[PDB]
Assembly symmetry: C2
Homo-oligomer: 425 residues x 2
């Protein structure tokens, strides 16, 4: 009826036949190009550079009062008795009792584009599985959250859920220069010593709670105002950034800035179930097969590339099987099996599972034969290897263990016979 | 300097005046008007009921054919046997091969009032504390998550981070009829049930992911569409409705649908900090006061009734004190304290706690001394008493302890003296 389990390993082709036993000529081959973690996020806050503007002095003649102008953030000091010799910038009768209301306020800049936006993510899961029925070749982007029915030629497929070990998208900070992996503490901006120095709740909000330092002083000379002014808090963090969000998470996950998602993430197993029409008329042709052989060539060390085996056989009929299965990996899944069919074929599981039981229909054999030698005489035997595998020499060396055990049976007997005499009376 | 943990109880007057060493006036009285859970949600989908569309069946003479437009949600049935002879609407050359192509599809109309939005929430808790510096009476919306400094009326406040935070919200579907607590798994449509089967994310496009059922079957008569439809899981459930999240909520929380907040949620403790700096004259140059005593009027069983108590003391000098304590039931906190004797005042004892700690300036005591007997014992009092308190009944029970102690001292004697005889030799 249904139901196989492929692991989530990308670019390796898996073959499923299932509806009921027997062979089909068109079977389902499916490959995963990539898993894709895509955000579903809450914007915690936005922070950005701000334009703090310090107006030059406004004077109020012969005794002022404090600021009762307001804005998004304001600081205000009232100096009294100012302009003691003046410069003719008094603009008053008074000079002995004038007041200067000095003022400063914050305004929010135009650098609030994404420089920087704090997100709490939990990711939603998206696949790019490539489906090949052997007559329509398409890949389709589709969500894997629970049950997901998809129909191609009115044969049912259900893409099941992927078991994610972890996702790279957490508390992260995004500048527009580059996604960056960096945690924050909530409501941590508007303060010094912690990330940010300005908090704005949404991008449209024209008012901000900002923290900046300014030192205003009174004039005391024939020139006109002393003040020292330090750069903005946000401007200090602009330089710092974070550390890149492009190499975080172990087990794949390449996070690329512009799609805002993480490609080629290998995690867990994907159950898949399908009801697919492969009857047709059964048999769908099953050639009986003879003279089954395994040639292994092209043996050169490495394992980050695929297997290269050649399988020789001879057949007594032409027909189509769906081979191979999962006990090995074929290039072709819709495959014409003919008389005298020697086939060099490509594999891709021969390093997760170096053993492979290659079938051509019903008939089958076991390979490989190429594995690192070390004895130093060549020795290669699968599926268990003694480290120098199963060989004469290994057996011979192992024979040590046997020695105490054999003598042990004799030892008991000699002890016993003497005891029988004592007991007898 | 600062810093207490108050419980969040609506309407309780909490008195903090912990400030630097030296007498520090102008106390903080703070009442909590409401806590306001301000949501921090991600929208999972938008769902509303739908407008089903038939574009009129298009009929084909001399052999039929199937549909060859398709839509996200579509149905196609080819009726056969339709019009067995030209019946008066056959519209056809052939009557042995008269077939009708029928098609139907659902679109979205957005046909709803505000029913319904599906959100994953965890809400953040924000307070609406009402704060009185004994100089002004004012309220402000301020976060109690994270450190949040603010200076209001020339006195510093920090509403600190939360001791613990909670919302009864989860996966919720907020109808305009009443918020209802419902579980669901998004992107899981496939079937005619499931809450929120219609999922729509583009509000600029008619696409919806849904699963629906439509029954269209070949009629044999010249009367032609059977048209019976068991609808979507959202629509099917819309008559049935969910159950309120508004009928139940541990620890306050009155949950309002349209603004999306939960008011007066007494969950957790709110840590508070103030540095008050307003002076006045510090020290406050207080009247010193002696003989503090408590009269307690009106005492029976547990009630929510207000306190009528009087304190007798003697005072010397006139000045302004900051009262009280850390826990008290007086409504005063700005009080001009003058020469006095018995001074009757109103309290909220048995409406904050049965214990009440009264201060007048530097001197304080803890009162009262009521607790009615219920065994029934003759005298019942608090607050370190055994609970029946020291009574005859208490004295007959204490006498337990007496029994072993007499016999043990007399037992030691008998044993130890007999041993001394034997030992002498």
């Amino acid at each position: 009826y249904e139901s196989t389990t492929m692991p989530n390993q990308v670019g390796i082709p898996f073959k499923a036949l299932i509806e009921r036993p027997g062979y089909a000529g068109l079977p389902l081959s499916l490959v995963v190009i990539k898993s894709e973690l895509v955000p579903s996020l809450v914007q915690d806050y936005i922070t950005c550079n701000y334009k703090t503007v310090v107006p030059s002095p406004y004077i109020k003649c012969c005794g002022g009062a404090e600021c009762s102008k307001n804005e998004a953030d304001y600081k205000c000091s009232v100096f009294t008795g100012v302009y003691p010799f003046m410069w003719g910038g008094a603009y008053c009768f008074c000079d002995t009792e004038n007041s200067q209301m000095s003022e400063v306020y914050v305004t929010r800049g135009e650098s609030c584009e994404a420089d920087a936006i704090a997100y709490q993510v939990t990711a939603s899961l998206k696949a790019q599985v490539m489906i090949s029925i052997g007559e329509l070749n398409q890949t389709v982007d589709v969500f894997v959250n629970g049950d997901s029915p998809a129909r191609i030629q009115q044969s049912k497929f259900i893409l099941g859920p992927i078991s994610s070990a972890w996702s790279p998208f957490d508390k992260v900070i995004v500048y527009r220069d580059e996604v960056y992996n960096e945690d924050y503490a909530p409501y941590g901006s508007g303060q010094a010593g912690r990330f940010g120095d300005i908090q704005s709740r949404t991008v449209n909000s024209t008012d901000v709670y900002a923290n900046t330092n300014l030192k205003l002083k009174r004039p005391a000379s024939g020139n006109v105002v002393p003040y020292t002014q330090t750069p903005s808090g946000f401007s200090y963090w602009k330089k710092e950034k974070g550390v890149p969000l492009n190499r975080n998470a172990p087990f794949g996950c390449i996070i690329k800035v512009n799609p805002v998602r993480a490609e080629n993430c290998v995690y867990g197993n994907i159950p898949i179930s399908m009801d697919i029409a492969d009857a047709f008329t059964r048999i769908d042709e099953s050639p009986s097969v003879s003279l089954k052989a395994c040639e292994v060539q092209s043996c050169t060390y490495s394992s980050d590339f695929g297997g290269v085996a050649s399988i020789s056989y001879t057949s007594n009929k032409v027909g189509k099987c769906a081979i191979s299965s999962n006990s090995a990996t074929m290039k072709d899944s819709v495959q014409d099996v003919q008389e005298s069919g020697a086939l060099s074929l490509f594999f891709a599981t021969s390093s997760v599972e170096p053993n492979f039981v290659v079938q051509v229909c019903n008939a089958r054999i076991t390979c490989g034969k190429c594995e690192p030698p070390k004895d130093i005489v060549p020795y290669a035997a699968k599926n268990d290897a003694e480290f120098p595998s199963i060989s004469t020499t290994a057996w011979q060396w192992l024979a040590t263990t046997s020695g105490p055990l054999t003598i042990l049976v004799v030892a008991i007997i000699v002890v016993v016979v003497v005891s029988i005499v004592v007991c007898a009376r």
